[PDB]
């Protein structure tokens, strides 16, 4: 299906993923898309963190949704 993802960088692009896929896989595609590693990749929703072992249908995010991407800057 199709889904929108926006990060603090203001970058916004529609990603492609299956409704049966797992947040563990999408994380692999999003990083390959923008190039940002998973460690810095994060998924938020109405104050709800998405688990790695969860299916899209589980969160019932439906199609044409907007996910809030956040960058976990460690720097230490």
């Amino acid at each position: 299906m199709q889904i929108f993802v926006k990060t603090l960088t203001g970058k916004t692009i529609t990603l492609e993923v299956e409704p049966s896929d797992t947040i563990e896989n999408v994380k692999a595609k999003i990083q390959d898309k923008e190039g940002i590693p998973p460690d810095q990749q994060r998924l938020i929703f109405a104050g709800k963190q998405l688990e790695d072992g969860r299916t899209l249908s589980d969160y019932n995010i439906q199609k044409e949704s907007t996910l809030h991407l956040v960058l976990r800057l460690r720097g230490g």
Partner: protein
Amino acid sequence: ALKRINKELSDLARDPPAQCSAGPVGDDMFHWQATIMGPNDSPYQGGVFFLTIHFPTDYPFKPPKVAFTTRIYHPNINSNGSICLDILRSQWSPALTISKVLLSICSLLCDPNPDDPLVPEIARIYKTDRDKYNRISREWTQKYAM
């Protein structure tokens, strides 16, 4: 209010603030929320903040209540999460784009001005006792931020 509140939702959905994500919970058009990430400059990097909103039953025309569920030791917010926002004051337009409000809070941390806020105790500490402020700042980070 169902119509008015939906007004911001239109501009929010079509294009929500990048600096911070936000949206109403369920179909209940009354409770709004948002989030903010460490701008990567102040002592709170990687610290995610969450703040809830409460619209009045008399339409935005009435000052909305806001609080901070997260324990932030910033010299501008009390314990009850009392955020100082001039917007609420006379600068409250019965039809303002809450989008600007969120940003106001973002710039607040990226540009504070310790003076006479609702937390004079934290002001003094931050004033000269910076060493300590840093201790609590980092201690209050893992506490709830992380």
